[PDB]
Amino acid sequence: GTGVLTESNKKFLPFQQFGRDIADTTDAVRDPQTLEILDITPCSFGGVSV
Amino acid sequence: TMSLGAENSVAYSNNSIAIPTNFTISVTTEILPVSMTKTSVDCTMYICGDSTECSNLLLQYGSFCTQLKRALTGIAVEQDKNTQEVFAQVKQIYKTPPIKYFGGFNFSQILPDPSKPSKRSPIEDLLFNKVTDLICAQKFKGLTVLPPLLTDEMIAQYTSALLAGTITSGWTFGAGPALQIPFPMQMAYRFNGIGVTQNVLYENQKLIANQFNSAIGKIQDSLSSTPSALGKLQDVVNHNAQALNTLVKQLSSKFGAISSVLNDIFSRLDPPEAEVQIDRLITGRLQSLQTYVTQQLIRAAEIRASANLAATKMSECVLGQSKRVDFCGKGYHLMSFPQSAPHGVVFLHVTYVPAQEKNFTTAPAICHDGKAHFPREGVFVSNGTHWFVTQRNFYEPQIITTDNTFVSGNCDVVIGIVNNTVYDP
Amino acid sequence: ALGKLQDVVNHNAQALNTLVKQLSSKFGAISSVLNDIFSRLDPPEAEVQIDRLITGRLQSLQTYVTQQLIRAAEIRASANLAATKMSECVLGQSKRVDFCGKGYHLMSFPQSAPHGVVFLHVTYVPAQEKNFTTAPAICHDGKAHFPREGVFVSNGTHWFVTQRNFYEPQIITTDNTFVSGNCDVVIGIVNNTVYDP
Amino acid sequence: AGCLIGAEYVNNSYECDIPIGAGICASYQTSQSIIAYTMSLGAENSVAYSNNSIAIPTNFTISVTTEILPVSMTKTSVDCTMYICGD
Amino acid sequence: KYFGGFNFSQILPDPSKPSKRSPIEDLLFNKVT
Ligand SMILES: *[C@@H]1O[C@H](CO)[C@@H](O)[C@H](O)[C@H]1NC(C)=O
Ligand SMILES: *[C@@H]1O[C@H](CO)[C@@H](O)[C@H](O)[C@H]1NC(C)=O
Ligand SMILES: *[C@@H]1O[C@H](CO)[C@@H](O)[C@H](O)[C@H]1NC(C)=O
Ligand SMILES: *[C@@H]1O[C@H](CO)[C@@H](O)[C@H](O)[C@H]1NC(C)=O
Ligand SMILES: *[C@@H]1O[C@H](CO)[C@@H](O)[C@H](O)[C@H]1NC(C)=O
Ligand SMILES: *[C@@H]1O[C@H](CO)[C@@H](O)[C@H](O)[C@H]1NC(C)=O
Ligand SMILES: *[C@@H]1O[C@H](CO)[C@@H](O)[C@H](O)[C@H]1NC(C)=O
Ligand SMILES: *[C@@H]1O[C@H](CO)[C@@H](O)[C@H](O)[C@H]1NC(C)=O
Ligand SMILES: *[C@@H]1O[C@H](CO)[C@@H](O)[C@H](O)[C@H]1NC(C)=O
Ligand SMILES: *[C@@H]1O[C@H](CO)[C@@H](O)[C@H](O)[C@H]1NC(C)=O
Ligand SMILES: *[C@@H]1O[C@H](CO)[C@@H](O)[C@H](O)[C@H]1NC(C)=O
Secondary structure, three states, rough: OOEEEEOOOOOOOOOEEEEEEOOOOOOOOEEOOOOOOOOEEEOOOOOOOO | OOOOOOOOOOOOOOEEEEEEEEEEEEEEEEEEEOOOEEEEEOHHHHOOOOOHHHHHHHHHHHOHHHHHHHHHHHHHHHHHHHHHOOOOOOEEOOOOOOOOOOOOOOOOOOOOOOOOOOOHHHHHHHHHHHHOOOOOOOHHOOOOOOOOOOOOHHHHHHHHOOOOOOOHOOOOHHOOOOOOOOOOHHHHHHHHHOOOOHHHHHOOOOHHHHHHHHHHHHHHHHHHHHHOOHHHHHHHHHHHHHHHHHHHHHOOOOOOOOOHHHHEEEEEEOOHHHHHHHHHHHHHHHHHHHHHHHHHHHHHHHHHHHHHHHHHHHHHHHOOOOOOOOOOOOEEEEEEEEEEOOOEEEEEEEEEEEEEEEEEEEOOEOOOEEEEEOOOOOEEOOOOOOOEEEOOOOOOEOOOOOOOOOEEHHHHHHHOEEEEOOOOO | OOOOHHEEEEEEEHHHHHHHHHOOOOOOOOOOHHHHHHHHHHHHHHHHHHHHHHHHHEEEEEEEHHHHHHHHHHHHHHHHHHHHHHHHOOOOOOOOOOOOOOEEEEEEEEEEOOOOEEHHHEEEEEHHHHEEEEEEEEOOOEEEEOOOEEEEEEEOOOOOEOOOOOOOEEEEOOOOOEEOOOOOOOOOEEOOEEEEO | OOOOOOOOOOOOOOOEEEEOOEEEEEEOOOOOOOEEEEEOOOOEEEOOOOOEEEEEEEEEEEEEEEEEEEOOOOOOOHHHHHOOOOO | OOOOOOOOOOOOOOOOOOOOHHHHHHHOOOOOO
16 A cells, blocks of 8 residues: 555554554554554645635 | 323413513523534545555546535535524624623623633633544545634624624614614613513612523523533534444445455456456445435535524524514513524523412403593503503503593493593593 | 526536436446447346446436435425515515514515515615713603603703604603603613603 | 645735635735635724613615525426436 | 303313314314324
């Protein structure tokens, strides 16, 4: 997918690898190389009014 | 088994009448929704966001999202017009004079407080503090809340201008120019509008002022204690949430496909067989969004009907004195004061309620010299021995003279005629 | 000016226009033409290719109908409001403020228009107002006199009684005011002499 | 509401023409260009209220106001054998 | 039930029937199926 990846404060568990949301979408992930809780978030979007 | 009320047996006779001997100034409250939460969905991001393959396939399903966006824009414009047609009824913002002595009536609970940074009345503070993440977990999937045009400060200024015009001028600032008038005379006019004479107010001004102040003070306690008073507005805040969160829950449904994630379908299967798996999700999500829009249409229609009712009440109860029963309060409507609230308006109806009734002997007419004397404005009562004439809303016994009754024919065809002498000055 | 009548002509037209635009869409099929699908494919697959189009067109027509229902409900509400105004503003003189025109309602005239009614509300707006010194009541010989129908005003030196909508100064006499109690409990009492014809 | 680029924010408040949101409203004013500003609710009037003063009108005017109200729409009918299945 | 000469027997509830309805309400309920 696409989005912004930032450092998250979600206290994941050693066996937990992903993280869902209300709409069954992945909010946070774990980098397989270095153990770190990321945060998947799309960039800015909205409506263009002329 | 639920009770339908108490049991009252009003004694009905051909000769007795109940005349009220005192009165009460009751301030009731009425809550009316005006606007909703303007929401705007996204065409592609809700159906399939962060996916370039589905963005190309969604274009072959007609211009459904365009119609949905048009309907949402229409709903937003309608909710803005609903707020503009209720509070913005005057073209001149009035101001309260520095001296706040209006005869004895204390309006400190409804006038705006300049010390507070919100510039709202103490009642509006409780109204806004009792009507209350999910505002960021829904934005990332198209659900966007548009801010209203008229902010809370502008609605507060509109309500303050309406209150100033009602206190200083009365009902003259709604018809034409604002005509200044002392508040005791305005209250005397309000009393004359329902039948009570001006002397009843001018001789009991302190009692009426004390009753009005006590009712205004008890209104704050009633609104602060009971949490279900501001419910009709909270429902508008609740259902809208149920209209959004559920619309989010529809993104976790597979609609007969293998999964609810389009990335997992595009990565595993090839497009030739992923088309049929993506079409079910697209159709299901489009149908869910269409259902959301067609329900929000009915909700906006109901809210527009409520806003029209609130505007009619603002025009008939605040800008004047309506004689419609149970429209501007329960009883003899005296006046009304508007206040703002989150997506709603609160009308404080000041009403005249009779009390402490007493039983007297009545008669249709009297004749002194063989000619029936009918009351010009009032009713004939008796105290057991003498006959007096009093109005239909307050016991004020007066002698029967020639200027209080008119002659019409002889007293031979009327039923219930009693002989009594009249006075001639 | 005639915009409210134009909108119901525009949206309705749009309600048809989009209803046609849903006929050129595939709804997930191979095309939007029936004969092309029946000629390029086999009857076994023709059903699975045409049922999607049938369902899409059925859903479009159902959406059109369920939107026209709400539109007809709004039009029915507006027509009920117009009928109430015709019965109250034209057939009589209603005292409802901001219902039969901005100001003191005098009369109303109905006019027809394409799918609509235009009410010309003839009203009464005061103007050229001026200030006066008012008083709740007056007492001549120890008995308060309250105005029967009007208001006591003053021009600086004399006191008159005028109606509440037009400045018509009249001499305060015994037939313009009524006596009710003494002038001891009223706030703002001013002494002034009354006339008796 | 968001980020508005293309119009300058003037401090004086005029009558709102093109509503934007949250009190901000745009218009095309005077070289002429598009400006944005906080909409004005009306004129700041102050009634000289007093215990003894009353405003009595001395004349009047008869004015005719116009109110447009829709009554009906265009009756539309559709058929199944032609809209969905063309011949 | 002497109200001056007006007979409200057709609108007041009749205690004879067990339904405790007025003579007009009987026809109102017997015409809506
Ligand atoms: C009038 O009312 C009284 C009390 O109900 C009743 O006794 C009397 O009969 C009534 N009038 C006549 C003359 O019927
Ligand atoms: C009227 O009511 C008030 C408040 O209940 C009371 O103080 C006053 O004495 C009453 N006056 C009469 C006429 O009984
Ligand atoms: C009005 O009420 C306020 C409290 O909100 C009080 O401080 C003030 O003294 C009162 N004024 C009068 C006229 O009694
Ligand atoms: C009038 O008489 C009736 C008789 O039933 C009584 O119930 C009622 O309280 C009386 N009203 C007063 C307070 O005079
Ligand atoms: C009736 O009123 C007259 C005049 O006020 C009074 O003199 C008389 O005592 C009253 N009678 C009763 C029974 O109250
Ligand atoms: C009223 O007075 C007349 C003349 O005195 C008399 O004939 C008549 O009987 C009286 N009626 C009543 C109600 O007493
Ligand atoms: C007040 O009115 C009286 C009678 O019309 C007139 O004689 C007098 O001059 C007036 N005074 C002023 C100051 O207008
Ligand atoms: C009215 O007249 C009385 C008696 O002459 C006097 O005591 C009172 O002060 C006067 N009031 C005014 C308003 O001049
Ligand atoms: C109105 O009356 C109050 C109380 O007597 C007084 O404080 C105030 O100054 C008066 N204002 C005027 C003269 O309009
Ligand atoms: C009332 O207004 C009309 C029109 O302006 C004017 O001709 C007339 O003289 C005015 N009358 C008064 C009383 O000023
Ligand atoms: C009232 O009407 C009923 C029939 O409707 C009749 O039997 C009865 O006698 C009437 N009573 C009176 C007051 O005449």
